[PDB]
Each structure stands twice: as C-alpha cells, then as structure tokens.
Design a protein around this ligand. Sequence first.
Ligand SMILES: O=P(O)(O)O[C@H]1[C@H](OP(=O)(O)O)[C@@H](OP(=O)(O)O)[C@H](OP(=O)(O)O)[C@@H](OP(=O)(O)O)[C@H]1OP(=O)(O)O
Ligand SMILES: O=P(O)(O)O[C@H]1[C@H](OP(=O)(O)O)[C@@H](OP(=O)(O)O)[C@H](OP(=O)(O)O)[C@@H](OP(=O)(O)O)[C@H]1OP(=O)(O)O
Lengths: 288, 288
Amino acid sequence: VCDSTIENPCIVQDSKTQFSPVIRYREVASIADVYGGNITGINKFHLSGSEQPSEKGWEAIAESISRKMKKVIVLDLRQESHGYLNGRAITLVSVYNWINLGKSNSQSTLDQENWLTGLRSRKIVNGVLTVPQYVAKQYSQGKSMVVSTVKNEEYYVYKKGFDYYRIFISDHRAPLDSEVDALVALIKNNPEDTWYHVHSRGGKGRTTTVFAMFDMLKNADKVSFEEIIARQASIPPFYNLMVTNREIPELTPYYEQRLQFLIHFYEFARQSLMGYSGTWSEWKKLNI
Amino acid sequence: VCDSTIENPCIVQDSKTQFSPVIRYREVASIADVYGGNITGINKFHLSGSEQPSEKGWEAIAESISRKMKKVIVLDLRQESHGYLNGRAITLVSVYNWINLGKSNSQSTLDQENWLTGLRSRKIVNGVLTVPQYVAKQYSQGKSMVVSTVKNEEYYVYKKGFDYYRIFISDHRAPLDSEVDALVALIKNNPEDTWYHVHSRGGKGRTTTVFAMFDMLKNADKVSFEEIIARQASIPPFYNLMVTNREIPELTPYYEQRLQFLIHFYEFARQSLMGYSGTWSEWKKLNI
Ligand SMILES: O=P(O)(O)O[C@H]1[C@H](OP(=O)(O)O)[C@@H](OP(=O)(O)O)[C@H](OP(=O)(O)O)[C@@H](OP(=O)(O)O)[C@H]1OP(=O)(O)O
Ligand SMILES: O=P(O)(O)O[C@H]1[C@H](OP(=O)(O)O)[C@@H](OP(=O)(O)O)[C@H](OP(=O)(O)O)[C@@H](OP(=O)(O)O)[C@H]1OP(=O)(O)O
C-alpha cells in the first residue's frame, strides 16, 4: 500500500473512466470574444489547452482542432510520471505531485517508462486510487484492475497524427530555465501556423503559465503585463496567475515565484521583440 | 549555374542555418515504450539515428548519447558527396541525389574531397541553393556565401571523440552486397556495447533500413519479419519499410527492391543466429 512518499508513491486515476470528457478545453483565440480590454494579437493564435485527457478525450480534442483548421504539436507540460491504464489517465503521485522533482528530464522519462513497463507486465494492477481517495489518504482502499492496456501519452497522440513534445515543469511551479529555453526554441523552430495543444494534469496552473508565455513572446511589446495576465484569465477555467494565495497555503511561495518569473519573462519577451537575440538563459544571466 | 545533371550538379544546403536543430533524432530502444507488439530484444540496443546534422546538431546528438550512457561510432550511410559550409550541411546533388552512383567507394570519397577542397580554396562560393529552390528548379537563384569554413563530416565527428565509418548506400536504394558485408563486419568487429549513431541525408529510408538490419541480426530468430519492420516504424518519423509507393513514383522499383533485400537479409540473419557462419555475399550466392 502506498503512502504518498517518494519511496512508496501512489497510483492515482485521473480519468473517472476511459470515456470521461474534457472539462477544461479552451482555445486562446476565444479571449477576443470575452475579454473587455486590450485584445491585440489574440485572435490569430493556433493554441488550445486542457487537463489530462482520457482516451476518449483525445478524440474530442482532435475533432475540436480539426474544426478550427498544418502541423499539430501536443505540448505535455508534466514533469511527473503519468500514463494510461485501460484508457484512464493515471499519475504516480508523491506529496504535492513531485515524484520527479530535481531529476533530469532523461531520468524523469526513464522512471516513467520503467513504471509503465512494470504495470504493463502485470495481469492485475492493485492499489489504483481515485483522486478523492488519495486526497482522503485512503491508501489501502484502492481497486484492483485487470490490465487490458498500459500506454503512455505518445500512444494516443501518435494515433491522431500529432507530434508529442514534453516540457518538464514541476506541478505548482514555474518552469526551470532549461524548459523555458526549450519552449522558446520549439516555437521558433516550427512554422508560425503550427497548432499547439497545451496540457498539464489539471489544465490550470502550468497550462495557463505557458499560454501567457506564448502571448508575451508575440505581444509583450504592444500589451501590458497586467493585461496579458488578465486576458489569459478571461476564459474558462479563469485561471488568474496574479493570485498567489490559493487552496493550499504551503504552496504560496511557488505561486509567488511563478508570478515573479512571468514578470521577468515578460521583459525578456519585450526586449526580444525589440532586437535582443539571445536565449532566456542568456538574457536572465545579464538581467536578473 | 547548375542543372542537376551529373555534368553540372547543384550545391544544396540541407541545414537552414549552422544552428538548426536535429528534427529526426530517435533511439531504437524507445520502441519498447511505444510499440504494442513483440518488443523482444529491443530495449538493450545502443542505437540512435537522425538526418544530416548541422554543426550545432552534432552537439545535441553528442549530449543525447552521453545521457543514455564505451565507444561511439557515427555511421554515415550516404554514398553521395556531402560536407559543410560555414557549419551548414551541404550536398552535391544530381537527379535523385545519385551523384556517386556506380562509383567505387574510393572514388566516391575522392570525388567528395576534391569537391570540398575546391570549395575550401574559394573566398566566395556561388550558387548555394536551399532544398526548396532545388526542388523548384531555381538553379540560378542560389546565394553567394563568404567562406568561413569548409569541412567534411569527420571534422565534427572527430571533435566529439567519436569514430566515423561510412557505408556507401545510394539514396532511395538498398545497400549493395559490399556494403551489407561491411556493416555486418563492423558490428561483429566491435564490442556489443558499442553505441552507433546512424544517419543518412533525411534520416528516413537508409537510416531505417539499417535500423532494421541491426534488429534482424540480433532478433530474427525470435521476432517475425513483419514485426521487425512494424516495430521499426513505430517511433518517429514512423518510416515504414513495407511502403513501396511513396512521394516519387519513379522510385517505386527501388523501394520494392529494398524490401525484397530485407526479406532475404532477414533469412540470412535468422540462419546466422542458427549456425550459419559465412558472410552475406557468400550466403546470397548459395540462396538467391
Ligand atoms: O488536476 P486537478 O484535480 O484539477 O488539480 C489542479 C492541478 O493540480 P493537482 O492535480 O496536483 O491537484 C493544477 O495543476 P496543473 O496540472 O494544471 O499544472 C493546480 O494548479 P496550481 O497549483 O498551479 O494552481 C490546481 O490548483 P488550484 O486549485 O489552486 O488552481 C489544481 O486544482 P484543484 O486543487 O482544485 O484540484
Ligand atoms: O532529406 P529530406 O528532405 O527529409 O528527404 C528525404 C530523403 O531523401 P531526399 O533528401 O533525397 O529527398 C530520404 O532519404 P535518406 O537520406 O534518409 O536515405 C528519403 O527516403 P526514401 O526515398 O528512401 O523514402 C525520403 O523519402 P520519403 O519522403 O518518401 O520518405 C525523403 O523525404 P521527403 O521527400 O519528404 O523530403
């Protein structure tokens, strides 16, 4: 039985079933129809986001993207190990969902796939908790499930003809410099018409952070910091990156640091649109 | 001005810039995390591949290989003459990229280095075409570039501490018997832990062919022909050697012949794992 430590992490089932719908799907361009302030540079984005989809959720997302259309890149923002059991999204959860905190991206991927390979070799997976059970610390009341399939996200992304690219952001936290560099390079290294579907575990904090980063990279020289953050918060689920006191108070330092990073990324983006040609890591060394 | 004939071949720049990233890097071992069928004998391969890297691409490849680790052998599969101008990968292109077709490997190397030496003696190289320009037959719209450096691949491979070994495969075609012999001997003559980075021009046809050959040599006695080909097609760029009708229909005969060779190489590999001790050329004489 798990105990949410890194030594005995929990299998937590994020999808209620393999048919569960996507509840936090949205397209950034819709901000132009809801936000009452500066909407300059919004309505042309090829950018959607969501929480972690179920098997069926990927179908709905693919259909949504096709209706709004080039290349489609699914942007997985999750550092933590995750995958699918019988079409249901699952996560390997330690306290604050930081199972892979402090690891190289190579080790994070290795640990995830070693875990998924282990589950895949079993006929029965025990100790599968729902999110309510995990929150309630009912570590021994998990269910035993006959294994039909165990898959990583790539399996479902590849099946839709999309690319998969992972940015290893720790839950509740700002991206590390390596991952900022990687995101900026990805955007620069792909056509401007590329569609990105950004997702995290909950489609809230990390997803909205990256939405804001996209917005700044394109518009920081014609839209104020406050309006970029505000307009990103204007569409459901209305995630406001200005808020640093949230449901879990022990996480406030990380929300404050994440907003502080966004302040600096905004200036980096603005100066980049004005002539600066280096990377985020190079700019940060000279300016912070 | 060039005209894509062997008498006036074109200088074609494969790298957009000297900083262009590697877009088709993958490791064969990853098949074990994506392929839903027989994965026996995959997860221990020390095998990566890519398209022709830019100067900077070699750095990324070296870093990738170090993260997954003995000797490292860069396996250049390209018969055609190629090199680098100011850090950008370049190719001497005749129709269907067959500038060195029918030549001995010694002559191919000689012709390449005579060409590179000629470019290196110039302060300005004229007629440098991008791939789009070449495809569009805009032979006179090439750019003139001040020569900072002209290098062969060895220069960058040696700088990373890797070995360089060339297998002279014609673009779009199966390897000739001499080159099959050479590949099999190379694998046999080096430790089983040796890391191989296999690349062609596009990191598609020739690279995937050799991936399959590696797989067969180790696993043909426990994995079916169809599953070796299928599992090699399971990871990006999803090159499926079963497909013989591709973008260019005049090349279908060569794709069919390449698949036919793989059928025979599979049997050779299987019998070799079962006791046969001769070379491919010896086996082919007795069995085809
Ligand atoms: O998946 P959910 O059940 O909807 O939970 C989300 C998820 O975090 P957890 O799943 O670990 O609880 C969000 O993170 P992302 O995967 O989208 O990055 C997190 O975002 P932040 O901590 O950055 O805010 C958010 O937190 P919050 O509620 O404060 O918005 C939290 O939501 P819930 O606590 O309501 O489940
Ligand atoms: O380098 P690319 O622009 O990506 O082109 C590649 C490259 O051929 P060319 O560069 O000469 O066009 C592949 O060859 P390799 O160097 O990897 O051996 C070739 O492989 P095949 O002809 O064997 O299939 C492939 O062809 P295809 O598209 O049919 O996969 C083709 O791709 P593109 O035509 O899309 O450029």
